[PDB]
Design a protein around this ligand. Structure first.
Ligand SMILES: CC(=O)SCCNC(=O)CCNC(=O)[C@H](O)C(C)(C)COP(=O)(O)OP(=O)(O)OC[C@H]1O[C@@H](n2cnc3c(N)ncnc32)[C@H](O)[C@@H]1OP(=O)(O)O
Ligand SMILES: CC(=O)SCCNC(=O)CCNC(=O)[C@H](O)C(C)(C)COP(=O)(O)OP(=O)(O)OC[C@H]1O[C@@H](n2cnc3c(N)ncnc32)[C@H](O)[C@@H]1OP(=O)(O)O
Ligand SMILES: CC(=O)SCCNC(=O)CCNC(=O)[C@H](O)C(C)(C)COP(=O)(O)OP(=O)(O)OC[C@H]1O[C@@H](n2cnc3c(N)ncnc32)[C@H](O)[C@@H]1OP(=O)(O)O
Lengths: 200, 200, 200
């Protein structure tokens, strides 16, 4: 006897078929549908749905439809946020993105997991831990960010990464599981790609 | 002497632009279209389309649109099935899923593949080997399951896994390619995440 | 610096909010919307759009909706092209696909990337390097192909690989990051999958 809602915040196992959760979900997923199916020319429309879908959205935010979430109202986005096609966020709990964050296509964030033992999840039980994307972070394509992960500022996450651990700031991380490939140093102020110098 | 119908069943190479296959594909993608572009409030309709779309569906099935498949009628689902956003199932041949199966967002299932040799696929020839998912299986995000793969009951597939070989029951598997990581023991019956236990 | 469209062609850092780039994108995303939302029965309309969406498309092209791209007009496709669901192509610059190329579902092609050093991207500045996919290439599901990569003729990219470097022709590459597994020999002329021969 503890409201599901309060079990989420406590990191306890819960289910979401009650206490107004389903109604919340239908509100968000309703806005999601008119965004996702809006005509590319309906820019103002899209512009308001964004402010509308997420609990928090800074200025100069852009999201290439389609976009997917469970609620929408648990996603708090910062300034100048760009997200490319198919950004999926399972926001059963807090998801926070800093400023000037760039998100490539087909990225997946999820504060939710299921107990490994199929007996702790007989009724699709879940747990939720907040994700936190720092400022000036860049996430490559097909990246997956798992429950309770924090990505430090100005860091980069390579395409295909499966982030399962916290990622410090100022690094470059990649792999399955995602691991720190390396620190970003002055050479990166000159070389922006493979063998290409900033001064051509 | 053997139709393409019999070739698929036999595991032999084939092509699907005859024997009514194309027309079969159209019927399924038509219901698929209606399902994928349905309003979140069209609850009844969504439920009826599901029992329509797939060959078999057990009680309490839920698929979060959009869903992608080739025929849909080659897929058999057990009971209490929950698939999140963008489940993709290339079912040129039979796909069987058990009960209490949980599928995270952006998961691709595929019974189909193509000869490695470009000489064998001059006309895009393929082979199809059924996929079999046990009961109480949980599949992480961005996981891909290749042709003829069998996942043993109660097993867990970590996010981003690329499954090319059969997974035994009662295991936690992950990686690229997927490798059995450990056995699911009774220590999992208390712990569900890092160091979070369960009390009375 | 110098004009934005030039920086592109020169592999220099650029932003795309001028020189008519946004409008160019709107026509693209417009034809894209018309394609993605078409009905499975509207085959003739789907074919006109294919020819209209991309710069060049050889005969026999088939693209299963939905398909995603930035401009569309920066894509050149050969002949007997086949792409399954959710092909995403960030064609900020040229993307060339040869003949008899088969693409599995959920593949992402991006000629664009961002300077890893945040100071070099304050205004989400990016670079773009063409992508060249040879003839008779087969790309598996959930593959990601990064900027300026060349996939040789007759090669195969396993499901889930993250292709960061060029792939030689006649090989089988897979992995994160993608690495050459072996060369396509003549045994591949008999065995097409796990242990199945052609005549026996
Ligand atoms: C926001 C938008 O919608 S547009 C942006 C869309 N862009 C993309 O999706 C492309 C994303 N780019 C990447 O992921 C690139 O791989 C980068 C930027 C992470 C490469 O990291 P960099 O430090 O610049 O590359 P670098 O050459 O030093 O790579 C070093 C090693 O890491 C490996 N590596 C690089 N990227 C990855 C990756 N994603 N996964 C695994 N390994 C990787 C390399 O293969 C290399 O191998 P080696 O050590 O054996 O030599
Ligand atoms: C179903 C829905 O629609 S909503 C929920 C969707 N959720 C997902 O897709 C999230 C999937 N979660 C995972 O993959 C988790 O990482 C789990 C389930 C595998 C947890 O791993 P566990 O087996 O419990 O063990 P643990 O967390 O200790 O991991 C141990 C090691 O495996 C690694 N690991 C964890 N997950 C993965 C993964 N997906 N791929 C590869 N390695 C992984 C860890 O990094 C760690 O590294 P180490 O050996 O250096 O210590
Ligand atoms: C166009 C369409 O719509 S068709 C539908 C799309 N189809 C798919 O997505 C299926 C993709 N198939 C694959 O990825 C398969 O793994 C193939 C075709 C690459 C098989 O590889 P093959 O060339 O036949 O060689 P083989 O199976 O022996 O692989 C050898 C090793 O490579 C590894 N390997 C194979 N495929 C992959 C992969 N995708 N990623 C990583 N490793 C892989 C194997 O695990 C194996 O491990 P080991 O050497 O330690 O034992």
């Amino acid at each position: 006897n503890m409201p599901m809602t309060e079990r989420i915040r406590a990191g306890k196992l819960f289910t979401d078929m009650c206490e107004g959760l389903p109604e919340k979900r239908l509100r968000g997923k309703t806005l999601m549908y008119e965004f996702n199916h809006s005509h590319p020319s309906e820019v103002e429309k899209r512009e308001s749905l964004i402010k509308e879908m997420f609990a928090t959205v800074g200025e100069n935010a852009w999201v290439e439809p389609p976009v997917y979430f469970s609620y929408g109202s648990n996603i708090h986005i910062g300034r100048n946020f760009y997200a490319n096609f198919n950004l999926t966020i399972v926001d059963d709990y807090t998801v926070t993105i800093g400023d000037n964050v760039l998100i490539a296509p087909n990225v997946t964030l999820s504060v939710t997991g299921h107990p490994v033992h199929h007996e702790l999840r007989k009724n699709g039980e879940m747990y939720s831990f907040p994700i936190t994307i720092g400022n000036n972070v860049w996430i490559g394509s097909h990246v997956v960010i798992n429950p309770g992960v924090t990505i430090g500022d100005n860091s980069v996450i390579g395409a295909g990464s499966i982030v399962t651990k916290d990622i410090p700031p100022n690094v470059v991380a990649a792999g399955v599981p995602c691991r720190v490939i390396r620190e970003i140093n002055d050479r990166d102020k000159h070389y922006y790609f493979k063998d290409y110098k900033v001064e051509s």
